[PDB]
Amino acid sequence: AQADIALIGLAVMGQNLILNMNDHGFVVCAFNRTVSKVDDFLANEAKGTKVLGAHSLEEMVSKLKKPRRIILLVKAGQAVDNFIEKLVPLLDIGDIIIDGGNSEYRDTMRRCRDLKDKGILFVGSGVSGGEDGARYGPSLMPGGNKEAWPHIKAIFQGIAAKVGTGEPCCDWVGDDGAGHFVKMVHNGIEYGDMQLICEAYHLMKDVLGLGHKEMAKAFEEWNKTELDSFLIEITASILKFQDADGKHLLPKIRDSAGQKGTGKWTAISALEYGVPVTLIGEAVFARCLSSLKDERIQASKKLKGPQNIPFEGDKKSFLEDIRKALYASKIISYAQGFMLLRQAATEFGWTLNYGGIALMWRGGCIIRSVFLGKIKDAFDRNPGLQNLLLDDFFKSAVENCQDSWRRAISTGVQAGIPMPCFTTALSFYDGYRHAMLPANLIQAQRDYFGAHTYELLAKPGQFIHTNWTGHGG
C-alpha cells in the first residue's frame, strides 16, 4: 500500500502513461515481464519521479493500495489471459484489472464475466493517441464492470486529454466489451478518413497536375475550414517534407499500406450485425488492393484506362469541389459509424451515450477534429437521434456539398482516378434517401428460384410465394 495503481508493460506507450499519471500526482508501481526494463526505466526516463518499481508480480501487488488497481498494456491475445492467470491468485475480492491493449471485444466480454464470478472487477479500455498522446493526454474509453469505475475515475479522467471547455476525453462507455468495441470503431473511422484524404490527394495530383508544394498549401487552407482535423494538419506537413537530398519524401515511399486488424474487425462486425458501414469496408479493401503491388505493376502494362482528356476548367473551383466532396463523404462515414455503434448497443444491451463517445473522440485520439464537436451537439439536441444525416446541421452540410460532390466524382470517373470511398459514400447517400429501392427485384428473384417468399408493400408481415415459372402452361 503506497502505489495508487500499477502498470505492466514498459513499451513507450506504457512508459508515457506512467509518466502522465505521475505528473498528475499518482504513485505508479511499474512492472514488465523482462524485469531488467523496470531498472532501466527508473534510472532513465523515470529518474526523480514518484514511481516505484517491482521485480515480481507478488511485490507489485504488495505495493498497491486497496482496491488494488493494475493496468495491462501488453500485446492483445494470449498474454492478457496469461497475466490474468497469474494475478488472480494474488488478488482480493474487489480488486481491479484494466486491459488497455486493443483487444477483441468478445474476449473482453468473456474475461469480464469470468473475473466477475471470482469477485474481481475487470475493465477493458481503449487507449488512443499514440505515444506522445499517452504522455500528455490520451482519449481513454473504459468499459466493463462499472463497480471498478468510481475507483479509477480520478486517474483516468485526470490524465485524459481535455477539450477547451475543461471536460476529459474519457468517461465510462458501458458494460463488458463496450469500451473495446468503441475503440475498434474509432480505428475503423480512422481508416476511412485516411483513404478519403488519399482520394482527394489523388484527384489534385492527377486531374489538376498540382505539385506537392501547392497540394500542401491546399491542405493547410482546408485545415482552416470545417475540415479542421489532426489528419488534415499532418497531411499538409507530410506533403511539404523534404528528404536529405532536398527532394520530397512522400513520392519515394512504397504504396503498400499495412494493417494491424482493428479496421478489418469494424467491417466484419458491420457484416455480422447487418449494418451498411460501406466506406470503412472500402477503406479496408483499398489497403488490401495496395498490398498487391506486384500484381498492379503487371496490370498497368496490360489494362488500359480512359481516353486522356486534359482538365479544361478552373483549377480553383475544382479544388473547392474536392474540398466539399471530402467533407460530404466524411459525414456519411461517421453516420455509418454511429449506425454500427447504435446497432451494437441494441445487440448487447449497452446504453451508450453517443454525445459522450463523440466527446471522447474530440481530443487525444487520431480522428480529433472540430467536426466531432458538431456531432456531439447533434446528440445533445436529440440523444435519441436515429441517424446523423437527419440532424439539421449535417443535412444542410450535405445539401450544400451535393453538386460539388457529384461533379468531383464524375470528373474522377472520366479521368480514371480510383475513388472507392468517395463513390461508396455517394451511393449510400442516394440509397438511404430513396423511399423505394430496386431491392424488390432481389426479393422477386429469390422467390422465383428458391421460393423464399416476399411481402407486398401494402400489408408488411404476410409472406406470399408466387408461382412464376409458368403462369399458364
Added chain:
Amino acid sequence: AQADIALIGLAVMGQNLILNMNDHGFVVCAFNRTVSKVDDFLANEAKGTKVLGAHSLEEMVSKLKKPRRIILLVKAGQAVDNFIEKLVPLLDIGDIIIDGGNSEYRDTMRRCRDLKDKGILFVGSGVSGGEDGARYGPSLMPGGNKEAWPHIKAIFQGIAAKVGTGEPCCDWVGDDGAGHFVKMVHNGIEYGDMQLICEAYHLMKDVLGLGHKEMAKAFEEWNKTELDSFLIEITASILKFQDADGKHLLPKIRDSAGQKGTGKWTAISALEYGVPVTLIGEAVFARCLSSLKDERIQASKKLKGPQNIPFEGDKKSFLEDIRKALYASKIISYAQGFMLLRQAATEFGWTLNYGGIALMWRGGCIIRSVFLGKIKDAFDRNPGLQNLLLDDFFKSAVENCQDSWRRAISTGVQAGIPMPCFTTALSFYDGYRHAMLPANLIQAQRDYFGAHTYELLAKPGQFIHTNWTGHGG
C-alpha cells in the same frame, strides 16, 4: 445391402434429389427425423419407384451396400453434428457421410478431420440449383476426404447437370472444407449479379423513364448477347408478370431484401484473408440498406437529391451503355471471386482447378451463363492465370465496355441513382490498373502518428521511421 445410398432429410430438395438418383438407376433408402414423412413420400411422390424407406437409423444403415454412403440434407449447424453423433456408432471403418447442406466451411474442416480419425470418410458438398434443379440436374461441389470420392463419383456425376459437350457440373473440388467454401463463394457471386441487375433496372426506370414492358424487352434482348444467363432470363419474366388484376406484380412488392448468411460469409472471408472482393461486399451491404425501409421513408422526406435535369440524349444509346456497364462490372465481380478462391487455396493448401470450378457453375446453379464458359477456357489456356482481367478476352471485353461504363456511371451520379456495385467495380478496376496508388500517403501517416514504419519504393524490405514532427525545432 440393397440400397446404393441413403439420404436423410425429406424436404423438397431432398425428395427431388432421391427421385433424380432413382431415375439414374440408383436404389436410394430414404429416412427423415419425423419418420411419418418417409411413409408419405413412398405413398405419394416416390410411389412406384425403386426407393426403399427406413424407420430408424439402424434399419437405414442395414439397408446400405458397403461402403455405406449416406447424405445429410438437414439444416446446417447443430443438426448435422447430432446426426453424425448417432451415425458413427453404427458405421464400419471406410463408410462415407456426405453433408449437402450449406455448412460453414470451418465446421466441415473440423468434422472431416474428426471422422478421419475414426476411419469414416467425410465429404461436404455444395448443392446448387433450387428444388427443380435438384430434380433433374444440380451443380454438386464435393470436397473433404478424397478416399470417399471414387465410391460416390458415379452417383454425383450421374445426377449432376451436364454441359452441352457432355461433362457433368460436378467434380472433386479439394480437401476438407473446399467444396463448401466454393459453394459459399458461388452464393456471394449470385448476390453480386442480382444487385448489378437491380442497378441496371434502376437506371432504365428512373433515368430513361422506361415502363416494365419496355424494360422486360430490353432484358430479353440482353439475354441474347454476352449477358446470356439464367438471372437475366428470369428478370425479363419477372418484369412482364401480371398480377390477378392485370397490373404488374413487381411494383407491389416490398423492397427489403432478405439474406440467409452465405453472401455475408463470402464478404467476411475476403476481409479475414485480405482479398479486395469489393462488389460482393457492396451487394451484401445493399441488402442491409434495403432492410432499413422505415428509416429510408423518413430520410426521403428530409434529404434532398440533385437538381432534376431530364435525360437529354438517345434512349437507345444509353440503354446500350447500361448493357456494357453491367457486363464490365460483372467481369470485375468474377475476377474478385476467383481472387478469393485463389487466396483460400494458398491459405489452406488446396489445389483447386479453377477451370473445373467454372464448369461446375456453368450449368445447374443459379449463376449459370455462357459467361462461365469463357472463364473456363481462360483457365484452360493458362491454369496458372493470376487474375481474370489479365486474360486477353476479358481484358478486351473491359476495354470495349469502358467509356459506356464511365458514361453510365456519370449519368447515374448526376441523376442521383444509387449504384454501389457499378461504382465499386469501376473504382476497383481503376485501382488495380494503377502501378502507383496514393496508399503511400497512408503509410506516411501511420509512420507519423504511430511509428509503424515504411518502405521506400526502390529497396522493398528495409523499414524506415522518419521523425516527421519537428525536422528542425
